[PDB]
């Protein structure tokens, strides 16, 4: 009924076989292990007519795999649309940092925009979002079939989520997240990896330690599918609303940025948008501080360098010369 | 980067029902209850450190201890010959004798401290639980498991042993002696629960899925019996199984009919009371059962001595006095 197989733990130094639940890290996999596919491309074409007919000008994907799906599929969607007699062109573009949410939804010349960059002609208020849920699974890579959701809510698809805790090390995981917690003196978040950054809510059914949580203390914000959990805390840090989430794909942990140093001083600047350690021109800012955070410093790392948590400001350098994460 | 994040469990696993094979790195929660032979062994780091806290215990007026987990008691069996020998060389006229395990592993209110004597067995008024130590061991490191003397006296099971996992909408809370499965079919509810032990500690919310918005009065496995405070510990139409047949000690809870019986939902049925077994002491089977507002299939337990029903499942026609019950 369960998952049976074998597993070796390098840190623990044992081998264990048996039966149970295996939560794999589907983020640092070398190949695309899972691909989204639609059960009925013809049904998707129908629900998009009705969308466009209702004044919905486009859609925004929740998860990264959803955008990749809309790319494999748009040639067949435009072919089913043309055969079906309707002057509507679908072109779906690339992914920004955050996968911004739309306020409309699908239900079970002129243009239809899926994802791509921001726009005033087709704002998010008029885009469908989070209208797919998982049906079942293929085998192997491995296929994931999607169908239209019966209800409009803001919760990430639960069939993709997973959590686990053992050896006093806990994980909240996803097709695009991997958030590690550990008990060292106290329970705190240690590492969190992102291939996407989404804008749905992490459903409490798939959350460890989800009682007595203050959103004002959650490191990964509730609004970015941060799990509402006391595993999502770190002493001396509050919600990272203005972290570098525009990076889209990034790596959070607690360590110094290469070549920098953080000191704890009451003279430091107040918490503001997350800044980067290298100036636009490439100069490195070596000296940093924070008012009441706890070392090692919260750091993000993305394709363009090392950033710090919101409470970590440069010590001597004027903040105006630095790149910060208020990207629109 | 250039960092290899295998601080985790790496290997491969095949799922019979899901019909896929998956390899990778992550967290593997194994079922340490339905194992055929003993996968884990309890051992003390320093028996002499233990000998100190046992003298020190009786010097505090403590006459014995009650084990928290089953593997703790089984450790006390292998370990008692040498604990009495270090006591003999240190010439304290106090003998350690350890017996077997009752149903529930009742808690004691005394405790050892770091730095005749009865381990387990049945109850007694000459050495009550008021004067028995309980939950004074925590895990040190690691197939083998090493134990050490605990710091603080609290009522929580050793967190280092607990585990939980959820995936593909199947949920699991697990222990050296527990295995609690919940699942999504229309709604989230408990489906199976396996017990090799029944303990009296509290399940720490840090190792609990969905620990918010729970009324303990709807938890199927009671909090006081190491029930996880979780909405996965829920079955529609059932309330806490306070007086379930936990005295069996090793039992198998699930939702299906007991062999040869039938449960119907009727408001004429009796109220929920202590769990009854389907066979009389003489071996007669009671075929007709009912429950007032429960949901089928019925909560049933199976233990070494036959089939029992959840608290809300009462006999339809048969008088309850003729039936074996768990009080």
């Amino acid at each position: 009924n369960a998952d049976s197989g074998c597993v070796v733990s390098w840190k623990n130094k044992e081998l264990k076989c048996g039966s149970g639940i295996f939560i794999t890290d589907n983020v640092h996999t070398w190949t695309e292990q899972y691909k989204f596919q639609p059960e009925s491309p013809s049904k998707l074409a129908s629900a998009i007519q009705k969308a466009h007919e209702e004044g919905i000008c486009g859609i925004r994907s929740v998860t990264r795999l959803e955008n990749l799906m809309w790319k494999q599929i748009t040639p067949e969607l435009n072919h089913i649309l043309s055969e079906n007699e309707v002057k509507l062109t679908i072109m779906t573009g690339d992914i920004k940092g955050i996968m911004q949410a739309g306020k409309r939804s699908l239900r079970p010349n002129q243009t239809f925009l899926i994802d791509g960059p921001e726009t005033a002609e087709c704002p998010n208020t008029n885009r469908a979002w989070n209208s797919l849920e998982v049906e079942d699974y293929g085998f192997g890579t491995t296929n994931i079939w999607l169908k239209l959701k019966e209800k409009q809510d803001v919760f990430c698809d639960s069939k993709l989520m997973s959590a686990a805790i053992k050896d006093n090390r806990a994980v909240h995981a996803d097709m695009g997240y991997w958030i590690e917690s550990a008990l060292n003196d106290t329970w705190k978040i240690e590492k969190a990896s992102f291939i996407e950054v989404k804008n749905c809510h992490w459903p409490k059914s798939h959350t460890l330690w989800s009682n007595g949580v203050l959103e004002s203390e959650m490191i990964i914000p509730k609004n970015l599918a941060g799990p509402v959990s006391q595993h999502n805390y770190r002493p001396g840090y509050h919600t990272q609303i203005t972290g570098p989430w525009h990076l889209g794909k990034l790596e959070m942990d607690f360590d110094f940025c290469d070549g920098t140093t953080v000191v704890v001083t009451e003279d430091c600047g107040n918490r503001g948008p997350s800044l980067r350690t290298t100036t636009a021109s490439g100069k490195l800012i070596t000296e940093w501080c924070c008012r009441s955070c706890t070392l090692p410093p919260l750091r993000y790392r993305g394709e363009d360098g090392c950033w710090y948590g919101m409470e970590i400001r440069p010590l001597k350098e004027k903040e105006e010369n630095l790149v910060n994460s208020l990207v629109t | 980067n250039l960092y290899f994040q295998s601080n985790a469990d790496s290997g491969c696993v095949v799922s019979w029902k899901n019909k896929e094979l998956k390899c990778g790195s992550g967290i593997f929660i194994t079922d340490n209850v339905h194992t055929w032979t003993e996968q884990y062994k309890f051992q003390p780091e320093s028996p002499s450190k233990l000998a100190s806290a046992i003298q020190k215990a009786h010097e505090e007026g403590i006459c014995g201890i009650r084990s928290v987990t089953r593997l703790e008691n089984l450790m006390w069996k292998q370990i008692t010959p040498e604990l009495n020998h270090i006591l003999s060389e240190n010439e304290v006229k106090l003998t350690i004798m350890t017996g077997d395990i009752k149903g529930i592993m009742q808690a004691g209110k005394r405790s050892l401290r770091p730095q005749t004597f009865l381990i387990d067995g049945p109850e007694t008024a000459e050495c009550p639980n008021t004067n028995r130590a309980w939950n004074s061991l925590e895990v040190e490191d690691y197939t083998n498991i090493w134990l050490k003397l605990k710091e603080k006296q609290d009522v929580f099971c050793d967190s280092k042993l607990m585990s939980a996992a959820i995936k593909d909408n199947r949920a699991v809370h697990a222990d050296m002696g527990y295995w609690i499965e919940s699942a999504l079919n229309d709604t989230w509810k408990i489906e199976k629960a396996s017990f090799i032990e029944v303990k009296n500690c509290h399940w720490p919310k840090s190792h609990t899925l969905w620990s918010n918005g729970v009324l303990e009065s709807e938890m199927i496995i009671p909090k006081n019996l190491a029930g996880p405070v979780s909405q996965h510990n829920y079955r529609p139409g059932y309330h806490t199984q306070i007086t379930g047949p936990w005295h069996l000690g090793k039992l198998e809870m699930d939702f299906d009919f007991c062999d040869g019986t039938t449960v119907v939902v009727t408001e004429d049925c009796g109220n929920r009371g202590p769990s009854l077994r389907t066979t009389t002491a003489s071996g007669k089977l009671i075929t007709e059962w009912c429950c007032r507002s429960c949901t089928l299939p019925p909560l049933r337990y199976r233990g070494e001595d036959g089939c029992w029903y959840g608290m809300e499942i009462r006999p339809l026609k048969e008088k309850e006095e003729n039936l074996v019950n768990s009080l």
Partner: single-chain antibody, 232 residues
């Protein structure tokens, strides 16, 4: 500030592999991202990827995932590039340049180039014009259109390089409009978002070269086709 030393020229048979090197001096862990580019004889520059020898952080552009393999030696701080199955389509001059991570700096300093001869025996930048002839004292105008904004954090991650024949490119303008130290103010660049223009005014005798625009706002890094400026 940084000195790049590439290996000698290589004449290789089709079907074999080649491994060329680049030795960096004056690097630190924090910079020292050694980028590699391919330049077909008198052609545009392709970005192959980078490897930081201290970190071993590496990145390849998609076109080269089967072709190029980047390796390192922390001790000497040397980057090696190996070129898998070789065809005459791989004949080019291969440059090693110091750069940074994604939206950061420009190709500060460049190696002299390794000439690979194979014989037996995305953001698209469109440059205008392809070639252009101009007289002394007059004004040269080169324009560069990006297919998507190359702007981020209030900067334009757009740069201009001049390449005399038989020599690596040199930075003239960085970040769309900043004059590299020591470059004459007769060179100037402007624009933002998707439309940029380099201006030489007045062109002079030394200014005969091929001029490239380059962006590093998003991977892969891309170049323009080039503008061959010729005197009269």
């Amino acid at each position: 500030e940084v000195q790049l030393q590439q290996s000698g020229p290589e004449l290789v048979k089709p079907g074999a592999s080649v491994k060329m090197s680049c030795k960096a001096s004056g690097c630190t862990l924090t910079n020292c991202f050694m980028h590699w580019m391919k330049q077909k004889p008198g052609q545009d520059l392709e970005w192959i990827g980078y490897i930081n020898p201290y970190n071993d952080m590496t990145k390849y552009s998609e076109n080269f995932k089967g072709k190029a393999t980047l390796t390192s030696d922390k001790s000497s701080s040397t980057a090696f590039m190996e070129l898998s199955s070789l065809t005459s389509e791989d004949s080019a001059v291969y440059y090693c340049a110091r750069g940074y991570l994604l939206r950061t700096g420009c190709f500060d300093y460049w190696g002299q180039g390794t000439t690979l001869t194979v014989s037996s025996g995305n953001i698209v930048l469109t440059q205008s014009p392809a070639s252009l002839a101009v007289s002394l004292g007059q004004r040269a105008t080169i324009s560069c259109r990006a297919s998507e904004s190359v702007d981020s954090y209030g900067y334009s991650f757009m740069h201009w390089y001049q390449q005399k024949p038989g020599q690596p490119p040199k930075v003239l303008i960085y970040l769309a409009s900043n004059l590299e130290s020591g470059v004459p103010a007769r060179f100037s660049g402007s624009g933002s978002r998707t439309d940029f223009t380099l201006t030489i005014d007045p062109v002079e005798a030394d200014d005969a070269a091929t001029y490239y625009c380059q962006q590093n706002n998003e991977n892969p890094l891309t170049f323009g086709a080039g503008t061959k400026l010729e005197l009269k």
